[PDB]
Amino acid sequence: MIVELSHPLIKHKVNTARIQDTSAEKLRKTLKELGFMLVYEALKDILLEEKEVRTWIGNKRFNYLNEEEIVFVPILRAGLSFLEGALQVVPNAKVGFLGIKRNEETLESHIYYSRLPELKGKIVVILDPMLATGGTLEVALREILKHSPLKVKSVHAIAAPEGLKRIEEKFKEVEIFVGNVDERLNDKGYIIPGLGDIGDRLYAVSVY
Amino acid sequence: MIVELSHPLIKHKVNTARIQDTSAEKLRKTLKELGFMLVYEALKDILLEEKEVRTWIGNKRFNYLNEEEIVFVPILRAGLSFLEGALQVVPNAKVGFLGIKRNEETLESHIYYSRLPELKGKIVVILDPMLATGGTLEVALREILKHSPLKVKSVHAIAAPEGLKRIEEKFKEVEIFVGNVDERLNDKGYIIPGLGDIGDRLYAVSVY
Amino acid sequence: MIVELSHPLIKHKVNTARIQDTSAEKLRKTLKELGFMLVYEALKDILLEEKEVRTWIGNKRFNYLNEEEIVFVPILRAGLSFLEGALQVVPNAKVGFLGIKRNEETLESHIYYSRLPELKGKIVVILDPMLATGGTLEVALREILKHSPLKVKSVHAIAAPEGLKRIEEKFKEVEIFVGNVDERLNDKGYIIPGLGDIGDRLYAVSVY
Amino acid sequence: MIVELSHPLIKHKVNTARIQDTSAEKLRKTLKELGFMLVYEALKDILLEEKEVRTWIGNKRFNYLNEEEIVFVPILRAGLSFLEGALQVVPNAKVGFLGIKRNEETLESHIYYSRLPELKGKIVVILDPMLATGGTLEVALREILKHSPLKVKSVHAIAAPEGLKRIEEKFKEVEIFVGNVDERLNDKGYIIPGLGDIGDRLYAVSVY
């Protein structure tokens, strides 16, 4: 189940990230603020738990989120741009790391780093700015669904119908949250209009 | 026009803020994150403007929020706990400051410090954790509406049906967003279950 | 006791803040980061206290700062730009607020808003980007020194010699920490090269 | 070139991190604020460059840091705890990623993931909470020095004497900035009193 968000400030953040003549500082801060918005939306169907706490007027009971039951998993590198934002929504959530890279020739993705915490029974939230062909997300899920997650959610700034197709086809139980679904993918597997080479725009030097 | 937010994460931030035995650091951080959510929600109906920018593939037109059209107005001191969260949603928004204080004997509010930028034609978003008797918000609006704002929004973590009444009776054109409408006001004008003396809990020493 | 910090990153943050064609977003972030540096430098001679804590390998004794012993006092409006960064150094410090504004004819200042926590025996750290004539700091000091604080420190991005001389002359006990001591003060009481109308550049509309 | 920092606030941040009973939220925030400090100290010798800019009073010439000429390199996953803090001092620096993992039997480190921007002629700053045996850092340097960086700096909250010795013995040109030099390494290659398993304390679950 795919879900495209329509909030005007998500569009703003997304479109603000499209602007190539912005500094890396601005891009990073924009995606972090977007990550907060995305994870916030993705957690709108979370169930709270009643717990007794202490207030200024004595003991009382209120509903709370079991922050520890949430596990964020950013795909380095771009996934990382969302992590700080995601943690602001859920400060005590665990964090898993997947080092993945797409083979620009075959368009396939491979895992070179995996440092995941105990995922069994918890709610996992994948973090990755773009969803192009879906190769990276497919390999990420493959690596994650093995630990028997309770539920897997994924957040992205933009997505290509191409990727949305396969994903929702081979991973129907996965919840996909997207800031904006773009037009298509080109001959090189880049989302159009997309964000170009965000990985390098974020932490290196963009070629555009 | 009152709107009570029902998002489970807002309820979590609010209740977390209800916890008296937390550190000032935790309270400030909690309310900063809640502020982001409250402002995010409050701008769900914001109108975007189309502008041309240079993307990685070339000049394209996308809809953007005119960040400078929004003006945040935190009521000192508590309102300040939402400022950073709000500025994350709209980084280049203008900021107005209102130094107000409630007489704990009559429960009347008075303005001691006013430093507001041009509000003429802009969307003003007032920030202040609690809306109890509505006194402080009334005085604030009284001086704000003069600048002939285009629209005035208000965000609060909690509010009492008491305050929501008068405010909506003398300022019906003002949109009031609240994380959770509490039960009532006590003998001393405090909200129940409310948050207590957050001002002192946030920057000084709580008397509870 | 005047101290002109010589750290290249402080100079950079200062000079960066001098750039007139930067967004409010960028300037606010610049100053927040500069604020962290200034307070860090201003607390280099702070005393730590031994306390027993539990580590991964059992109880142990280490030296810790008594965070609640420090009080940050931002002078609205400009001084608020330091508050966020100042709190990163000392998260649980107390926060006092002073709404002061300078009379642009006599070059003297008046306090319109004062909300301070207990200051007796505490270490007060005044926050305010500029120290021009020093009229604002003087008025702030008068108001603070009455509460008998254990020590008073002040951080500024920049300052004019005439301003410094004026403060150190009457307050030989106050420690002034400045990112850079500029050239002089023009006939209007503005520091040169200075930062211009910082308050408005930060939260409203600059006239330059 | 090794350098043990003595600033009380660094000591405080470092010692606060030793508190095993703190939430992941508190630890992450503490290390972020510490990372800022460590990097701030590490760039104290940084060289600035003169550039002409537009100020409120016209064009002027000031010294600035060429932010882009700086490259931060955290070692996953612990190194990530200093990233944001490090980026606060140099917002536009480039970011390199090194996925490393120590073998708990031989205490050897191996690089499974590498995503580095162009390091040739730049100032590289490695980020890693601890520096126990030196294996992780040694491997890292050997892939970084190959790019012929202008200079290499490294920051750590704590380091074991034996770790510092091999490093300084194999990389005399590398500047190692340490928050506090602990006592030693145990039989399992853990620093004492050390921080335990910070990687798990930060993003997963600690066994202590």
Curated annotation (Swiss-Prot), chains A, B, C, D:
* Activity control, per UniProt: Allosterically activated by GTP.
Q: Name one GO biological process term.
A: guanine salvage
- What does the record say about how the cofactor binds? Binds 1 Mg(2+) ion per subunit. The magnesium is bound as Mg-PRPP.
- GO annotations of cellular component type: cytosol
Q: What is its EC number?
A: 2.4.2.9
Can you tell me which residues bind uracil?
191, 196-198
Instruction: List the pathway annotation.
Output: Pyrimidine metabolism; UMP biosynthesis via salvage pathway; UMP from uracil: step 1/1
Under Gene Ontology molecular function, one entry of this record is:
GTP binding
Q: Which domain of life is it from?
A: Bacteria
Q: Membrane spanning segments where? A: none
Q: What positions does the entry give for 5-phospho-alpha-D-ribose 1-diphosphate binding?
A: 77, 102, 128-136, 197
Reaction(s) catalysed by this chain, per the record, are: UMP + diphosphate = 5-phospho-alpha-D-ribose 1-diphosphate + uracil
* InterPro entries the record matches: PRibTrfase_dom (IPR000836), PRTase-like (IPR029057), Upp_B (IPR034332), UPRTase/APRTase (IPR050054), Ura_phspho_trans (IPR005765)
Tell me the keywords, alphabetical order. Allosteric enzyme, Glycosyltransferase, GTP-binding, Magnesium, Nucleotide-binding, Transferase
Q: Which cofactor does it need?
A: Mg(2+)
Any signal peptide, and if so, which residues? none
* Disulfide bond positions: none
Keyword match Glycoprotein: no
- UniProt key word Nuclease: no
Q: Spell out the HAMAP family in the cross-references.
A: Upp_B
This molecule's function is given as: Catalyzes the conversion of uracil and 5-phospho-alpha-D-ribose 1-diphosphate (PRPP) to UMP and diphosphate.
What family is this protein classified in? Belongs to the UPRTase family.
NCBIfam families according to UniProt = PRK00129.1 (NF001097), upp (TIGR01091)
The name on file for this protein is Uracil phosphoribosyltransferase
Species of the source: Aquifex aeolicus (strain VF5)
